[PDB]
Design a protein around this ligand. Structure first.
Ligand SMILES: CS(=O)(=O)N(CC(N)=O)C1CCCCC1
Ligand code: NI
Length: 341
């Protein structure tokens, strides 16, 4: 049974709704981004129209093997008509290819679905500036004031400086970065750039990255592990056992590992500053957890919503408990009373 918050009223449209079989009345299925909780259910046998970004379309075709005739890519920042309804895709500042969707309903209502997003003041000068939005379907992942983290720029500065220092001190150190989905590519690309290396990875991860329209990508990544001193591994292998095992396979080329686990928020944000972050260490292996978020902080979310001034908000994350739902509704009312809308 498809839940109400994945349906767009007054249309034949759903958003991120592929795990419910054939949804009654759905003439077009929108996909905001290529993360498994959102695409769950799509495969080579899907036979309905899918609307998405070009990058998402590349991943559907090459990784899930969806047939080309059912993939409908749309350009960003461009008014398009889909099954008689005007829509616009906007950059979500999430992972590559991720979008927000603006729907202009036949009755005059305007709906924004954020998909997953990291709110930014730059969104205040998109096509959102032009008109009123009545309903907002909101990525509420971190909708509580305890959720603080630094800018992406500050986290990358920390990672670059940390990696460059370690490898300049010991030229026989290897850098490893964890991954389990698309997103957060800047972490490993920025470290490899400062070290003058390509990023080495499996054939499967190389395939994924080749779908993302990143400029000059062939100059930045490789499947030749022996040529690279920055390696990507599955996130599950970023632990002392898994890294010890990987070091053995490198044939005495290296005598130290510096590893990075880009998490979302963790409780150590409530205590510590980014500059003060320290690794976990056992012998010649050190592991850094770095708070690189592709979701809005509480303050970023609050600013976006108080700017947009929607008439109704529908959360799309943390919807499963009465405590979470009550907490979110209390913040939405606070924000409106403070701003005066
Ligand atoms: C826009 S708001 O004031 O924050 N809001 C809560 C919400 N979920 O939109 C409600 C206001 C009263 C009518 C239902 C909507
Ligand atoms: Ni996501």
């Amino acid at each position: 049974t498809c839940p109400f918050y994945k349906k767009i009223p007054g249309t034949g449209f759903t958003v991120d709704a592929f795990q419910y079989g054939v949804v009654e009345g759905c003439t077009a299925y929108f996909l905001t981004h290529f993360h498994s909780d959102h695409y769950a259910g799509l495969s080579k046998h899907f036979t309905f129209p899918v609307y998405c970004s070009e990058i998402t379309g590349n991943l559907l075709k090459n990784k899930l093997h969806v047939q080309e005739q059912y993939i409908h890519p749309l350009p960003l920042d461009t008014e398009c008509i889909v099954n008689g309804v005007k829509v616009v895709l906007l950059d979500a500042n999430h992972c590559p290819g991720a979008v927000m969707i603006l729907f202009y309903l036949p009755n005059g209502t305007v709906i924004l679905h954020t998909g997953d997003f990291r709110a930014d003041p730059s969104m205040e000068r998109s096509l959102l500036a032009d008109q009123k939005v009545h309903m907002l379907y909101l990525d509420t992942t971190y909708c509580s004031p305890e959720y603080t983290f630094p800018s992406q720029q500050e986290v990358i500065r920390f990672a670059i400086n940390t990696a460059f220092e370690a490898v300049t001190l010991n030229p026989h150190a290897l850098v490893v970065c964890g991954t389990y989905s698309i997103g957060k590519e800047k972490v490993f690309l920025a470290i490899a750039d400062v070290l003058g290396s390509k990023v080495g990875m499996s054939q499967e991860k190389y395939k994924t990255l080749q779908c993302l329209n990143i400029p000059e990508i062939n100059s930045l990544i490789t499947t030749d592990m022996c040529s690279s001193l920055v390696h990507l591994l599955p996130m599950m292998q970023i632990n002392f056992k898994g890294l010890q095992s990987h070091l053995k396979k490198c044939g005495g080329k290296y005598n130290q590992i510096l590893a990075f686990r880009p998490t979302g928020w963790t409780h150590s944000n409530k205590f510590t500053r980014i500059a003060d972050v320290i690794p976990q260490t056992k012998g010649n292996i050190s592991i850094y957890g770095i708070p690189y978020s592709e979701h809005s902080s509480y303050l970023e979310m609050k600013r976006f919503v108080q700017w947009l001034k929607p008439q109704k908000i529908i959360p799309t994350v943390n919807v499963g408990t009465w405590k979470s739902r009550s907490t979110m509704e209390k913040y939405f009312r606070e924000w409106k009373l403070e701003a005066g809308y």
